[PDB]
Amino acid sequence: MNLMITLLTNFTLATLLVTIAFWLPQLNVYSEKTSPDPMGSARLPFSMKFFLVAITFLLFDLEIALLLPLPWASQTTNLNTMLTMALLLIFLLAVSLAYEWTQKGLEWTE
Amino acid sequence: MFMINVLTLIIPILLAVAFLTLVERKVLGYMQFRKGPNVVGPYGLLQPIADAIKLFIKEPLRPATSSISMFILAPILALTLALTMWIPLPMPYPLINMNLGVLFMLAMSSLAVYSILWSGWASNSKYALIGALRAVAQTISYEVTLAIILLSVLLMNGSFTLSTLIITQEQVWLIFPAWPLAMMWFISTLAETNRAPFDLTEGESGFNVEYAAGPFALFFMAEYANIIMMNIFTTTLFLGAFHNPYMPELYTINFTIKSLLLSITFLWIRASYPRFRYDQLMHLLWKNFLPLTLALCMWHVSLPILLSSIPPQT
Amino acid sequence: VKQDMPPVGGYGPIDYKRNLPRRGLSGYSMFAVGIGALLFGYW
Amino acid sequence: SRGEYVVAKLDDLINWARRSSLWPMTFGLACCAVEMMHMAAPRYDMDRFGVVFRASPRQSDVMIVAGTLTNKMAPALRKVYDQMPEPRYVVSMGSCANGGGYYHYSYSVVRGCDRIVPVDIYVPGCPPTAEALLYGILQLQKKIKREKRLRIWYRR
Amino acid sequence: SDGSSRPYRCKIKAPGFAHLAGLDKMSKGHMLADVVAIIGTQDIVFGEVDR
Amino acid sequence: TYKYVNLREPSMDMKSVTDRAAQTLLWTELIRGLGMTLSYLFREPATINYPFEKGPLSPRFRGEHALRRYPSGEERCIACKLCEAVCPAQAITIEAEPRADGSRRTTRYDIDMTKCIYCGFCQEACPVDAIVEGPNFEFSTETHEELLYNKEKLLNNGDKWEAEIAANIQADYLYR
Ligand code: SF4
Ligand code: SF4
Ligand code: SF4
Numbered sequence: 107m108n109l110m111i112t113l114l115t116n117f118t119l120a121t122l123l124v125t126i127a128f129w130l131p132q133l134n135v136y137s138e139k140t141s142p143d144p145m146g147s148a149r150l151p152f153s154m155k156f157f158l159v160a161i162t163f164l165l166f167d168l169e170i171a172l173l174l175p176l177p178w179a180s181q182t183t184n185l186n187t188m189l190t191m192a193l194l195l196i197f198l199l200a201v202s203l204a205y206e207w208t209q210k211g212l213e214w215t216e
Numbered sequence: 217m218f219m220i221n222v223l224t225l226i227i228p229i230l231l232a233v234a235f236l237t238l239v240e241r242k243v244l245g246y247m248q249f250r251k252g253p254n255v256v257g258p259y260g261l262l263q264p265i266a267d268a269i270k271l272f273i274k275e276p277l278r279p280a281t282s283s284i285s286m287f288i289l290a291p292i293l294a295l296t297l298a299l300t301m302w303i304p305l306p307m308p309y310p311l312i313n314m315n316l317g318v319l320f321m322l323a324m325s326s327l328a329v330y331s332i333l334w335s336g337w338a339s340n341s342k343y344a345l346i347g348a349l350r351a352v353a354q355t356i357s358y359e360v361t362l363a364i365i366l367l368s369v370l371l372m373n374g375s376f377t378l379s380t381l382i383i384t385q386e387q388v389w390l391i392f393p394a395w396p397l398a399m400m401w402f403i404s405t406l407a408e409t410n411r412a413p414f415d416l417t418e419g420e421s422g423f424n425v426e427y428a429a430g431p432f433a434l435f436f437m438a439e440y441a442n443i444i445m446m447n448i449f450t451t452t453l454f455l456g457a458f459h460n461p462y463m464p465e466l467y468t469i470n471f472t473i474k475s476l477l478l479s480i481t482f483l484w485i486r487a488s489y490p491r492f493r494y495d496q497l498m499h500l501l502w503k504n505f506l507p508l509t510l511a512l513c514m515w516h517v518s519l520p521i522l523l524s525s526i527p528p529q530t
Numbered sequence: 531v532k533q534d535m536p537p538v539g540g541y542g543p544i545d546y547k548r549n550l551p552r553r554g555l556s557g558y559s560m561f562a563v564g565i566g567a568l569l570f571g572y573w
Numbered sequence: 574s575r576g577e578y579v580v581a582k583l584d585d586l587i588n589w590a591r592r593s594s595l596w597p598m599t600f601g602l603a604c605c606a607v608e609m610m611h612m613a614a615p616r617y618d619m620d621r622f623g624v625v626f627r628a629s630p631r632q633s634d635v636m637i638v639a640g641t642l643t644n645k646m647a648p649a650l651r652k653v654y655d656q657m658p659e660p661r662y663v664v665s666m667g668s669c670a671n672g673g674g675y676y677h678y679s680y681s682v683v684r685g686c687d688r689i690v691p692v693d694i695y696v697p698g699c700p701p702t703a704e705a706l707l708y709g710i711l712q713l714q715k716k717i718k719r720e721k722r723l724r725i726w727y728r729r
Numbered sequence: 730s731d732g733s734s735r736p737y738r739c740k741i742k743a744p745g746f747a748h749l750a751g752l753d754k755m756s757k758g759h760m761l762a763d764v765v766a767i768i769g770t771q772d773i774v775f776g777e778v779d780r
Numbered sequence: 781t782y783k784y785v786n787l788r789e790p791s792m793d794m795k796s797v798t799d800r801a802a803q804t805l806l807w808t809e810l811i812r813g814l815g816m817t818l819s820y821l822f823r824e825p826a827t828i829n830y831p832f833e834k835g836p837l838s839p840r841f842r843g844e845h846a847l848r849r850y851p852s853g854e855e856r857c858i859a860c861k862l863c864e865a866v867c868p869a870q871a872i873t874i875e876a877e878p879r880a881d882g883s884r885r886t887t888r889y890d891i892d893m894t895k896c897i898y899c900g901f902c903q904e905a906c907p908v909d910a911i912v913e914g915p916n917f918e919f920s921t922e923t924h925e926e927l928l929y930n931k932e933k934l935l936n937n938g939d940k941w942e943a944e945i946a947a948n949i950q951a952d953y954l955y956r
């Protein structure tokens with residue numbers, strides 16, 4: 107409960123800071139800004155490379171989560187099976203990186 | 217007595233990032249043959265107070281907010297993720313001791329991009345959205361390489377607990393048998409904080425252009441808190457100092473010294489190199505950092521089995 | 531008469547060529563030091 | 574009484590806070606911008622006064638109009654001034670932004686930047702020297718130093 | 730010169746005026762962040778460009 | 781008479797290739813840049829403490845205009861209108877009439893300091909050294925009309941700064 111106490115205290119201090127930054131200068135009577143970017147009227151272009159590198163990040167992070175439990179696993183009895191599994195998984199990461207290299211993935215956003 | 221400890225952790229964080237701004241200002245001044253602030257008080261001691269009181273009475277920028285709730289929520293989330301994340305650091309004992317503290321910091325550092333995403337979404341300008349997407353892509357890729365490097369580091373350590381890492385670095389430092397991992401971690405701490413020579417958040421439009429000066433100050437304090445956090449993390453985990461169980465303040469002084477010289481090294485590196493391009497650092501990771509990092513992970517997961525040096529879980 | 535004039539022996543020589551120091555340790559020796567640090571840390 | 578003394582103390586506190594951290598927006602138009610950059614040199618060193626170099630125009634407190642303000646640039650300058658948050662101050666470099674100077678009778682030169690934005694400090698020169706603009710900045714700091722916002726608010 | 734003490738016509742040729750004229754060909758096929766360097770490598774000062 | 785910059789063919793031997801590989805991996809030129817920045821950190825900065833210290837200037841310095849006087853109390857200007865004819869910005873307006881004693885003196889000598897470009901043509905065209913581009917430069921004003929000088933402000937400037945304008949012109953006049 108101490109962790110949640112720290113989280114609540116920190117979140118309330120952030121709330122106090124944003125309340126000071128948002129409502130405290132409203133006491134002043136400066137002006138009202140009527141205010142009548144390079145984007146004139148065109149739609150936002152769908153740069154496909156950003157989406158591709160985002161889902162590549164997603165897949166790599168997923169199998170990084172697969173790769174994670176080695177420090178806990180290092181105390182297991184069957185060390186040979188662990189070594190084979192870890193080397194083959196990192197080899198799978200290398201193979202996926204090589205494929206993402208070959209099929210024009212790392213071009214125009216290298 | 218716990219809330220006193222929480223307050224004494226969270227208020228010096230704000231003082232430390234204000235003095236980050238002040239010390240960075242006079243160091244960048246003195247690095248470039250000029251002088252920093254010395255007019256306000258003795259050696260510019262009262263400059264951050266003037267900065268804070270100036271930034272806490274100014275007018276906002278008044279943006280056409282598409283989502284008011286998201287615009288409010290983004291700086292609160294940014295400050296929360298920068299401030300509550302300092303807990304599990306073992307100096308010499310953490311405020312809250314977790315068995316998976318490094319995983320805790322890694323998860324929240326991975327999700328810290330939500331503030332950037334909401335800042336891009338709150339601004340109706342599409343170029344700000346494009347810059348936010350570019351920053352998010354850079355951050356998530358560089359979090360991937362951080363995850364691999366940290367995975368290698370604690371499989372060398374063998375346990376996820378941060379307090380046992382001090383015990384691990386007792387005879388020799390971790391930088392001696394993990395120097396290439398040390399260099400990749402130094403580029404990653406230089407690069408993950410949206411910093412020069414990879415600072416694309418200033419060159420050509422920021423990700424918070426339409427945000428007000430108060431939220432901009434909150435974002436800057438959050439970024440500098442993350443900078444000090446990961447600098448102290450590098451100091452603790454690659455340059456672990458001697459810790460007496462009866463005499464702790466020597467360890468506190470020692471890792472404070474290493475943290476200060478590592479922050480000075482940060483200000484050094486940021487003042488010596490021109491900015492890169494987006495495709496340049498994308499090429500830096502996706503074709504140069506990732507295979508070497510994978511090979512280092514393979515070598516460091518194969519080494520302790522062949523050396524009869526598998527570290528204890530407990 | 532009096533006017534701004536160079537001295538009767540002229541001014542001294544002024545360097546204008548490029549002059550960079552150039553310094554290094556060899557790559558083989560640096561890799562040997564890295565190997566030694568690696569083996570010491572592993573031991 | 575208590576109230577006037579308290580608001581006077583708070584007024585000079587916030588006045589020192591505002592005047593000690595003047596963040597500028599430099600308009601790089603013409604010769605006087607190069608003179609501003611040479612005032613940013615290590616010899617003169619604006620940065621010891623609490624004045625940062627080349628801040629963004631969305632967070633700046635003061636604007637220095639350095640150069641000639643033509644007809645094609647006046648709406649852009651007015652837009653920039655309207656975007657900059659309150660309180661905002663304007664310092665005029667050179668004869669161009671003062672009254673046009675050399676190009677006062679040209680067909681496409683605005684005769685003074687006072688016709689577009691309110692101007693507080695006029696710095697004369699062509700270009701004014703770097704220490705002259707430093708003295709003008711100190712004069713702006715002294716102008717801020719005698720502001721009486723809270724006293725007038727309490728008296729009203 | 731028209732013979733009086735005032736010039737009839739005085740054209741100023743700018744080295745940077747023709748240098749900016751090739752900017753469309755200068756940055757063909759390059760990235761949007763390279764124009765801050767393509768402008769940099771030509772000594773372009775907007776005083777003599779706009780007269 | 782012409783030299784080929786960036787036409788140095790790199791060596792293809794094992795020594796230079798290995799040294800370039802060590803430079804690429806160990807960031808040796810980056811280390812050189814770090815060393816240069818460290819060396820330039822420790823030097824004494826050239827920051828002069830304005831306003832307690834002032835920059836070096838010459839006696840020929842062009843600044844605020846002023847109207848001088850003879851060493852008998854009489855104003856030097858004779859309303860000859862050379863300065864308003866030579867002024868490239870037309871900042872000088874002169875209106876004159878013969879005064880009570882018959883002397884040819886000005887009645888209106890206006891200098892628009894917002895129009896003036898500080899070129900010093902008036903101080904050299906003046907045949908009696910009446911108008912001088914004086915040494916003052918710290919005269920920034922808060923209002924536009926305070927930079928529109930009449931004859932009285934210029935004469936007050938001359939009376940204020942004569943004790944140093946006379947010394948400057950005494951030190952400088954042999955070059956003219
Ligand atoms: S006032 Fe003179 S120096 Fe300044 S921009 Fe105008 S012409 Fe150039
Ligand atoms: S210095 Fe030149 S521009 Fe100024 S008043 Fe004299 S002649 Fe005119
Ligand atoms: S040139 Fe000299 S004497 Fe002639 S009108 Fe001007 S100030 Fe007077």
